[PDB]
Amino acid sequence: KTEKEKFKDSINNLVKTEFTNETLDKIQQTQDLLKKIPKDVLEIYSELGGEIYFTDIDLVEHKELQDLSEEEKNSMNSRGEKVPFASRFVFEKKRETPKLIINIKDYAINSEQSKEVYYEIGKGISLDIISKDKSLDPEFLNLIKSLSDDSDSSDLLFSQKFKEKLELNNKSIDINFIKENLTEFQHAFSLAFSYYFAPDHRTVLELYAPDMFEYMNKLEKGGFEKISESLKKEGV
Amino acid sequence: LEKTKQLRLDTDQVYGNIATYNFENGRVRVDTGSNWSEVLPQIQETTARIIFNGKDLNLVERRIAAVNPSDPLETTKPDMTLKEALKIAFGFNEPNGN
Amino acid sequence: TVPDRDNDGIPDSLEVEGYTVDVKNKRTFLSPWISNIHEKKGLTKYKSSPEKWSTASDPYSDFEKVTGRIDK
Amino acid sequence: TVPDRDNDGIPDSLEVEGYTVDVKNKRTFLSPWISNIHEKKGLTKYKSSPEKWSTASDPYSDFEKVTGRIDK
Amino acid sequence: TVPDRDNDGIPDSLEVEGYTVDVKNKRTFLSPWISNIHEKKGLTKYKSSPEKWSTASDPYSDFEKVTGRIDK
Ligand SMILES: [Ca+2]
Ligand SMILES: [Ca+2]
Numbered sequence A: 001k002t003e004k005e006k007f008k009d010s011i012n013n014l015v016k017t018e019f020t021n022e023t024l025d026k027i028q029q030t031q032d033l034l035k036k037i038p039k040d041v042l043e044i045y046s047e048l049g050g051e052i053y054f055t056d057i058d059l060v061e062h063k064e065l066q067d068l069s070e071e072e073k074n075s076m077n078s079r080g081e082k083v084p085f086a087s088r089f090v091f092e093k094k095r096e097t098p099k100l101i102i103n104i105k106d107y108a109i110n111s112e113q114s115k116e117v118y119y120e121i122g123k124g125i126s127l128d129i130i131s132k133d134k135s136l137d138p139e140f141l142n143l144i145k146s147l148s149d150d151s152d153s154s155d156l157l158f159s160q161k162f163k164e165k166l167e168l169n170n171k172s173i174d175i176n177f178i179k180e181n182l183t184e185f186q187h188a189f190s191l192a193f194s195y196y197f198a199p200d201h202r203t204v205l206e207l208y209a210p211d212m213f214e215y216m217n218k219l220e221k222g223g224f225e226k227i228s229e230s231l232k233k234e235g236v
Numbered sequence B: 001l002e003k004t005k006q007l008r009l010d011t012d013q014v015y016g017n018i019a020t021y022n023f024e025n026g027r028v029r030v031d032t033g034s035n036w037s038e039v040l041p042q043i044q045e046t047t048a049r050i051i052f053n054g055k056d057l058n059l060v061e062r063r064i065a066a067v068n069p070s071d072p073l074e075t076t077k078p079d080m081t082l083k084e085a086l087k088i089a090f091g092f093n094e095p096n097g098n
Numbered sequence C, D, E: 001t002v003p004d005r006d007n008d009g010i011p012d013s014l015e016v017e018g019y020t021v022d023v024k025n026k027r028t029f030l031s032p033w034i035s036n037i038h039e040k041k042g043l044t045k046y047k048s049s050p051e052k053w054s055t056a057s058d059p060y061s062d063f064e065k066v067t068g069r070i071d072k
């Protein structure tokens, strides 16, 4: 009855009915990686001139990144450390136009390389969700204040430089503190973004940071909608 | 037998059941339709044996899962090194690198 | 859908015209035999019968035999 | 939904790329391995095979051995 | 619906944070532990494990023991 029906589903991913190429499966896996973020965040990125590219050229000898600094060749990954640019396979370049170049891989099997694209995407739309009046939103400031008190979400999300700098200030109370550490305040949003949209990492965010999970959940079902509207109305 | 006094006892095989979990009510119930002679030949062919008598001269036979490179299901197991097998199967440690 | 008469889990055109099994990261992947892609990797070309659940009539299917889901 | 081939209650990317089991208030939570949190607690980083119900082919699954819901 | 992992008929917040059992007219009610009310009645404050159907691993659930629906 349901025996062969569930035996078929238990091998429904295993058998491959028509294969016919090799680099065509990386293209499909990249597209199905990308199309499972919602439709709204892509419009939020494309409002300010966002660009998503699929190449097989590794990100060293690509034609559009041949002329770059050393402080952008040494930028930080999701884990905090700098990545060698021979090793980096996904990069967002926004020196004048926000452009993100994705090298294709087999992303459905590889849910570790599938998190760096989510991290750089959350890096992309970061400030335009954080900033409203050219300043960090005070609701997000209350959020960072509440997360630094909890001893678990603190060392989940913040980089160690942030925690070893904040107790020197013992209180994110200064107007200069936000203006001096905006990269960390952006990184804390992009890390929670990548934890939210990697579909086996949501329960990490739910239990280790329950009030950051609710911030991203409120952003998920209509916050993107409102920010896309308020950007597209001023888009003319 | 009364002249030479030699009579010993061999052990050919051992029957016996497995008791598995029950998710419904947490209890553990012996299933009487499955013995270890359906299980132990499958352990003896996908693992690797390590015997060790460094604890007061007693042999402690253990078995760690290891990859067989000519079987498509068995090539899905994680790569197991001798240091990791000695560390997780018996209880070695490396407090100074050694 | 893809027809499968014998109910062994591998479709019929694969059993007639060849197939192979390999793992990719840690997951097995049953595939049709493409000539100049698998022959340089050194896999095998299995062919079977699309009407029998087990082509040698023994109690192990073609799928369990080539996949390893068998009595070891 | 999340893929789970072997049907042992733990997804494929966690079994391949590392996981652990942690309690928070009184409830156990199986989670992917994060070194910034699971090293200070002194936990273990497990890796199993995503297409076997029990990687050592014994009758206790990979879920049960790490969770403790097993024969005591 | 309230969560109940172990399926012993009593919610997890009550098992972790305290509960008690008392009859009102001729009917049994299971209640969260309120020190302002339940202490003067002379009742008892139970706690148990929200993951185990029976906290002492004997074949009587935590509901059956405190309620009276047990082998006498
Ligand atoms: Ca067939
Ligand atoms: Ca067949």
Ligand SMILES: [Ca+2]
Pocket (backbone or CB within 6 Å): D004, D005, D006, D007, D008, D009, D010, D011, D012, D015, D050, D051
């Ligand atoms: Ca699994």
Ligand SMILES: [Ca+2]
Pocket (backbone or CB within 6 Å): D006, D008, D015, D048, D049, D050, D051, D052, D053, D054, D055, D062
């Ligand atoms: Ca498994």
Ligand SMILES: [Ca+2]
Pocket (backbone or CB within 6 Å): E004, E005, E006, E007, E008, E009, E010, E011, E012, E015, E049, E050, E051
């Ligand atoms: Ca309960």
Ligand SMILES: [Ca+2]
Pocket (backbone or CB within 6 Å): E006, E008, E015, E048, E049, E050, E051, E052, E053, E054, E055, E062
């Ligand atoms: Ca209980």
